[PDB]
Amino acid sequence: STGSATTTPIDSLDDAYITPVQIGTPAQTLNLDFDTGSSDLWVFSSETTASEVDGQTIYTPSKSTTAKLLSGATWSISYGDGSSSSGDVYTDTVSVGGLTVTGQAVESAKKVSSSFTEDSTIDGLLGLAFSTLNTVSPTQQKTFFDNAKASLDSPVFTADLGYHAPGTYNFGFIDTTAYTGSITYTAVSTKQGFWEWTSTGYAVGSGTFKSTSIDGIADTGTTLLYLPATVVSAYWAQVSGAKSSSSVGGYVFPCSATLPSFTFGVGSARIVIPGDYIDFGPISTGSSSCFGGIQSSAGIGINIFGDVALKAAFVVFNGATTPTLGFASK
């Protein structure tokens, strides 16, 4: 089997991407944030504290003839951005782009943090990291991909995120028309539950490539590119007037700037992030100071190849017995 679904930016900055997901019988379609950095499929629901719902579409398990309470199961998650959610668990039928999993754990939120409430466009998350990170207790549950894998034509999914435009998540096949040149594959460590890999280096603009190992995670659920402070300083030094602002919480730059590209290595291959991908617009409405899309990972504890990086590539998440990651230009 295979599935193919379009993923759409939630706003003009590509702050996140949403993908429609069918849950239950009859289908209830919710727009979920596909997150290769976590492993819970959770939704706003009829059980979510009313004051914490503000415009989201909710899953109502009582209206699904295939929903079953997973007795005794609870979940609770906190994300790298400080947001969180928690609740109980149903199993139900879940379909993405024509690919159907029966008995998928659907984690129903009783509580969500303010940042979730305040984002009306995201109805929940669909985790695509390794199931070892799933938070359901006392019986850990599998991700949608993990459940679908054996049925897929090939045990893979691909992320093809757009810049200021829709893109695609495919399950079970590689669309050879969706990228240019070849796909370069690189080793993955699953030891921390992530799609963790080692970039071979970077370049800033038309500058020379610096060969250096950068361990980090491919994370579709993180907006920005978080890299070591040395690398980030080298990037922003090429932008007149750019500075790290403790008050704003990262590098900012004059909105009048033309940003240089940023290249990262995948083995001997190179992925070029155009400068415009690194512009996250005014820090506040009407400001001429703009927020940078490349930020320091210092104090995160891990480097994160978030959407800024991934949207410059066609990315293969290969869930073979020994997982790997593939990157192609597009």
Curated annotation (Swiss-Prot):
Transmembrane segment boundaries: none
GO MF: aspartic-type endopeptidase activity
Keyword Cytoplasm: no
One GO-annotated biological process of the protein: proteolysis
Keywords per UniProt: Aspartyl protease, Disulfide bond, Hydrolase, Protease, Signal, Zymogen
Disulfide pairings: C255-C290
UniProt catalytic activity: Hydrolysis of proteins with specificity similar to that of pepsin A, prefers hydrophobic residues at P1 and P1', but does not cleave 14-Ala-|-Leu-15 in the B chain of insulin or Z-Glu-Tyr. Clots milk
Documented EC number(s): 3.4.23.22
UniProt key word Phosphoprotein: no
Catalytic site positions: D35, S199
Domain Peptidase A1: 17-328
Superkingdom, taxonomy of origin: Eukaryota
UniProt family annotation: Belongs to the peptidase A1 family.
Entry protein name: Endothiapepsin
Stretch of the intact protein here: 90 to 419 of 419
